[PDB]
C-alpha cells in the first residue's frame, strides 16, 4: 500500500489510491506522445524555463517540500531542506548547462564529415528510493526533461506524498502534463511498463535487490538501465590525518540522515596506532547525538524511516554480535513509538562475520583496525561493494594517491561525501554502474546519432 | 557444437572440444590477477606496444585470418581482407589514443578541487558473433586491453577457429597470457561466468534473442552492459538524388556479405514518381550476382553461414508472400550444397504482413513506397529497430536535416553503412544501447572515479 506514515509518530497522515491498469496505459500513451512532440517541434526553451520555474517553486515553497519529506520519511527538517536546496541547484544546473550538453559533436576523420547528435530516445521510467526522496528524482528528472525524454515514476511506498508533489510541482512550473508523471502501481505493474515499447529506458537508486529485480526485467525487454544502488564505504585515516579536521567530520559523516545513506562512512578504517584514540573520539562525537523530533530544530537524530527499517538495523547489529564483534557503544534501545536507533558503535569484526561485509543503513559506526597503509586499502577494497569512501590526510598529494587506489567510483578528501550538480555520482561492484549528475549524467538515455558523408 | 563446417560445402573442417569447469575457473582466475596486476602496476606502453603488434601480425598475416573466416562462416575471402584491414587500424586506434583517453578530467567546480580518473574494472566477457567474427572481437578487445581490462570471449559455435585464432593473434603478439581467452562453453557456463565476481561487465554483439538472454543474466546479477543487435536500416531515396551515385552504391548496400549485416541497406524507401525506375535499377543491380566459391576473386555473393541462416531467410521471403507481397526478382532455388540463397527482391509489403518489421538476414531486397518525404521519415521510424540507415539526396545539408528526423543511431549520406575506428557505432530500440568504437567505445567499462577536495 501506498501510505504516508510519519516515523517520528508511527501514525498515518495520507493514503493514496492504486492506479488502474487503463490509468497506467493512458499515461505511457500521453508520455508517448509527448515524446513525439518534442522531437517534432523545438521546444527546448519552453523546458529551459520551465525547469527553472520547478527551482523558483522550490525557493518560494523550500519549507513545504521540506516538511512532506519529513512526514513522509522521518529525515530531520533541517536535512530536508537542504535537500530542497540541492534540487533547485540541479534544476538551475541543467537548465544552465542546456545548450552546451545539447550541442553536436564534431567527429575528426580525414575520410569525409562526421559528427553526432545527442538526441531524445523516449519514456524513462525512473524507481527512486526513500532516503532522498526529492533529490534522487531531480538527478534523473532534470537532464531527461531538457533532452526531451518524458519521464514516468515509480517511488518507494513509503514516500508517496513526495512522489506525489512532485508531480504537482513539475506542472505547477508550467510543464507539460506527461513530463513526469507518478506512478502508484504494484510490481507487477511495473513490469508491465518496463515491457512496454514506449518505454526505454530504466534508472534506479535504491537497494541491489530491487536493482536485481529491475535490472533482471529490462535486460529481458532490451532496456537501457542505470543502477544507483547502495554502498559500504571506506573511511581511511591515514597515518598523517589532522585529528582536529577528522573529529569535525565525523558526525556527519556516519549520521546524516540516521546513517540511511548509500554514501554514509560505514566502515572506519584506522591504523592500529590510532585504533584506541579513534574509538574513544567516534565515542565522544556519538554521544553528542539528541534524538527526538525531527521539526524540532534541537533534534540531530531522526527516527530511522519505517518499522521494518529499524528491526533490520537491530537484528544487523545482533547479528554482528553473534558472530563475535565488540560492543564498543551504544545498542541500548529507545522507548518510543517512533522508529528510533541509538547511534551504536561496533568493532572487532572478522571475515567469518556476516555485518563484515554487509551495508548498515543506519546510525552504527563500524572500525576496523589495520596494520600498515597497504592493508587499509586491501581491506578497503574487500567488499562487494564500491561507492563513495573518504581519505583523510594532511598531504594532499598522498591522498590523492591512496584515492585512486581504491576500488569505488567516489572519493572525498578529508571530508565525508556530499554531492553538487557539476560532480558525477556512481559507484562500481554492487553498488551500480553509470553515472548521475555533471555532463557524465546527462546523456546516459540520449542516443547518440552518428551523421557521417564519406568523401 | 563448436564446430567449423565450410558453408561453401558443407564440410566439416574441425571440432572443438568444449572447456571444462576446471579449466573456466583457472582462466577466470588468470583474468582477474592479471587485472590486479595493471592495477597495482603501470604496464600500458607495454600493452600500447602489443596492441600495435596486433596491427602488425594482421597485416603479415592478412590471408591466413582472411581465410579462417572464410572457412568458418562463408563470407567472401576479399571481404575478410576487408575485415582484416579494420581490425588493423582498430588495434593501431586504440594504441595511438591510449593517453589521450586515460587522462585525468578536471570538473569545475567553485566548492574546492575536483576531477574523476578512468580505470579499469576487472574481467569483462565479450559475447560475439559469425558475421564478422574477427571485427566485432576487435571493436571491444582494443579499448578493454589499453583501459587494462583483461577480457573472456564467448564466440558463435560456427566461428571456432576465428575465436580460437584471436587469442593466438593476441599471444604471438607478446601480451600476457589472460589478456583475451577464447571459451568454447555452454550456455550453462556463460550464465556462470555472468554471476562470477571477478567478471564485471558484459558486452555482446549479435541477435536480440541472444541479446535478451545475455542481458537478463547480466542484470540479475547487477552487471553492467552494452547491446549491439540487429537493424532494419531504412535506406531513403529522396526526390534529389543523383541516381548514377546510387546505381554505384546498392550492390554493396544490401548483398555486401550476403546481406547479412545488422546496417544491410534492408528497407529501401522510394517516392511513387520514382518506384518503377527503382525496381528496375535494383533488378538491374542484383542480377550482376555471381554466387560461388567465396575464396575464387570472381565471386561475387557468398553462401549464408549455416544451413539453418538459409531456411530462415527462405522462410521469411515465402511468409512474405503468403502474406500478399510481391515477387519482383529472385526467390529461385540454387541448386548446391553450399548455404546458398539466391539475390531476392519483394515490394507490397503492408502493415499486416509480417515481414514488413522483420530483419531479413540474407540478400533480400525491401522496397517501400511513400507518397512524400514525410511520410518516408515515419516509414523509417516505424521499425522496432534503429542501427543505421541511408539518407541519398545530392542536397547533402537537406540529408543532413532529413537524417536528424531519422530514429536511428547512424544515418549515411549518399552511401551504404561503414565504419571506422573514429566512428561511433550503436543503435536504439531493438537495435541495442551503448555505443563501440570512437572515444564513446572507450569508456564503456571504465570507472568513472571522482576525487573531491573540498576548500
Redo the contacts between chains.
Keep these: 500500500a501506498y501510505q504516508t506514515i510519519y516515523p517520528y509518530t508511527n501514525e498515518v497522515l495520507h493514503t493514496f489510491d492504486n492506479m488502474t491498469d487503463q490509468g497506467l496505459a493512458d499515461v505511457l500513451e500521453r508520455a508517448h506522445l509527448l515524446y513525439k512532440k518534442w522531437?517534432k517541434e523545438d521546444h527546448l526553451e519552453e523546458r529551459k524555463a520551465q525547469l527553472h520555474q520547478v527551482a523558483n517553486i522550490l525557493r518560494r515553497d523550500r519549507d513545504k517540500y521540506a516538511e512532506i519529506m519529513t512526514k513522509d520519511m522521518g529525515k530531520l527538517f533541517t536535512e530536508a531542506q537542504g535537500e530542497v536546496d540541492l534540487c533547485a541547484d540541479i534544476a538551475d544546473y541543467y537548465a544552465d548547462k542546456a545548450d552546451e550538453f545539447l550541442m553536436s559533436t564534431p567527429?575528426?576523420?580525414d575520410?569525409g564529415q562526421?559528427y553526432?547528435?545527442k538526441?531524445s530516445?523516449g519514456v524513462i521510467l525512473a524507481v527512486e528510493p526513500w532516503n532522498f526522496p526529492y533529490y534522487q528524482i531531480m538527478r534523473v528528472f532534470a537532464p531527461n526533461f531538457i533532452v526531451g525524454n518524458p519521464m514516468v515514476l515509480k517511488h518507494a511506498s513509503i514516500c508517496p506524498r513526495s512522489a506525489q508533489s512532485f508531480e504537482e510541482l513539475v506542472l505547477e512550473a508550467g510543464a507539460e502534463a506527461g513530463s513526469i508523471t507518478n506512478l502508484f502501481i504494484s510490481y507487477d505493474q511495473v513490469s508491465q511498463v518496463i515491457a512496454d515499447?514506449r518505454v526505454?529506458?530504466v534508472c534506479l537508486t535504491g537497494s541491489?535487490r530491487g536493482?536485481?529485480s529491475?535490472?533482471?526485467?529490462?535486460?529481458?525487454?532490451?532496456?537501457?538501465?542505470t543502477?544507483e544502488?547502495g554502498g559500504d564505504d571506506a573511511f581511511i585515516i591515514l597515518d598523517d590525518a589532522d585529528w582536529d579536521q577528522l573529529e569535525k567530520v565525523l558526525y556527519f559523516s556516519r549520521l546524516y540522515n540516521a546513517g540511511q545513506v548509500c554514501t554514509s562512512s560505514k566502515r572506519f578504517i584506522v591504523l592500529d596506532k590510532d585504533y584506541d584514540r579513534f574509538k574513544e573520539l567516534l565515542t565522544k562525537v556519538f554521544k553528542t547525538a539528541k534524538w527526538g523530533d525531527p521539526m524540532d530544530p534541537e533534534t540531530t537524530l531522526a527516527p530511522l524511516s519505517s518499522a521494518q527499517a529499524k528491526a533490520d538495523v537491530l537484528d544487523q547489529i545482533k547479528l554482528a554480535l553473534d558472530h563475535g564483534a565488540e560492543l564498543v557503544y551504544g545498542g541500548e534501545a529507545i522507548d518510543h513509538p517512533g522508529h528510533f536507533v541509538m547511534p551504536t558503535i561496533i568493532a572487532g569484526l572478522t571475515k567469518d562475520n556476516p555485518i563484515y561485509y554487509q551495508e548498515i543503513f543506519g546510525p552504527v559506526g563500524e572500525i576496523y583496525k589495520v596494520s600498515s597503509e597497504e592493508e587499509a586499502i586491501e581491506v578497503a577494497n574487500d567488499s562487494?561493494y564500491?561507492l563513495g569512501g573518504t581519505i583523510f590526510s594532511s598531504n594532499?598529494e598522498h591522498?590523492?594517491a591512496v584515492?585512486?587506489?581504491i576500488?569505488?567510483?567516489?572519493?572525498?578528501?578529508?571530508?565525508g561525501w556530499?554531492s553538487?550538480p557539476?560532480?558525477?555520482?556512481?559507484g562500481?561492484?554492487?553498488s551500480?554502474?553509470?553515472?548521475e549528475l555533471?555532463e557524465?549524467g546527462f546523456t546516459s538515455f540520449v542516443?547518440?546519432?552518428?551523421?557521417?558523408?564519406?568523401n
Design positions: 522531437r567527429l575528426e576523420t575520410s562526421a553526432y547528435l538526441q530516445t515499447k526505454v529506458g541491489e536493482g536485481a529491475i535490472a533482471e526485467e529490462a535486460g529481458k525487454n532490451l532496456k537501457k538501465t543502477l544502488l562487494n564500491g594532499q591522498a590523492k584515492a585512486a587506489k576500488e569505488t567510483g567516489m572519493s572525498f578528501i578529508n571530508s556530499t553538487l557539476e560532480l558525477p555520482f556512481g562500481i561492484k554492487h551500480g554502474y553509470g553515472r555533471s557524465l542516443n547518440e546519432h552518428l551523421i557521417y558523408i564519406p
